[PDB]
Amino acid sequence: STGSATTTPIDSLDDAYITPVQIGTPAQTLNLDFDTGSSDLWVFSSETTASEVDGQTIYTPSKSTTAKLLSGATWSISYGDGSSSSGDVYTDTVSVGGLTVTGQAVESAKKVSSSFTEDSTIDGLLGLAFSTLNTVSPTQQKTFFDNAKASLDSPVFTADLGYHAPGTYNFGFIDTTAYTGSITYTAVSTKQGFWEWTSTGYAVGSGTFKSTSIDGIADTGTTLLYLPATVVSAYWAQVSGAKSSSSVGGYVFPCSATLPSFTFGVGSARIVIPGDYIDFGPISTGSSSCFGGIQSSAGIGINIFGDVALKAAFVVFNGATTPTLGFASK
What we know:
Blueprint: E1 3-9, E2 17-23, E3 28-35, E4 41-43, E5 68-78, E6 84-96, E7 99-112, H1 114-117, E8 124-127, H2 144-148, E9 156-160, E10 167-171, E11 184-187, E12 196-204, E13 210-218, E14 225-227, H3 229-236, E15 243-245, E16 250-254, E17 262-266, E18 269-273, E19 279-282, E20 289-292, E21 294-296, E22 303-305, H4 307-310, E23 314-318, E24 324-328
Parallel strand pairs: 3-8, 4-7, 13-22, 14-21
Antiparallel strand pairs: 1-2, 1-10, 2-3, 2-6, 4-8, 5-6, 6-7, 9-10, 9-23, 11-24, 12-13, 12-17, 14-22, 15-16, 16-20, 17-18, 19-20, 23-24
């Protein structure tokens, strides 16, 4: 089997991407944030505290003839941005782009933190990291990809995120028309539960490539590119007037600037992030200070190849017995 679904930016900045997912019988379609940095499929629901729902579409398990309460199971998750959610668990039929999994754990939110409530466009998350990170207790549950894998034509999914435009998540096949050149594959460590890999270096604009190992994670659920402070300082030093602002929470730059590109290495291959992809717009409405899309990871503990980086590439998440990642230009 295969599946193919369009993913759409939630706003004009590409702050996140939503993909329609069918849950239950008859289908209830929710728009989920596909997140290769986590491993829970959770949704706003009929069980979510009413004051914490503000415009999201909810899953109502009592209206699904295939929903079953997973007795005794609860979940609770905290994300790197400080947001969180928790609740109970059903199993139900879940389909993405024509690919169907029966008995998928659908984690129903009883509580969500304010940032989820405040974002009416995201009805939940669909985790695509390794199932070892799934938070369901006392019986850990498998991701949608883990459940589908054996049925797929090939044990892979691909992320093709758009810049200010829709893109595609494919399951079970590699669309050879969706990228240019060849796909360069690179080793993955699953020891932390992430799609963790080592970039071979970077360049700023037309500058020379610096060969240096940068361990980080391919994370579709993180908006920005978070890299070591040395690398980030070298980038922003090429932008007149750019500075790190403790009060704003990162590097800002004059909105009048033209940003240089940023290149990262994948083995001997190179992925170029155009400068425009690094502009996240005014820090507040009407400001001439703009927020940068490359930020320091020094306070995180891990480097994160988030959407800013991934949207410049066609990305293969290879879930073979020994997982690997592939990157192509597009």
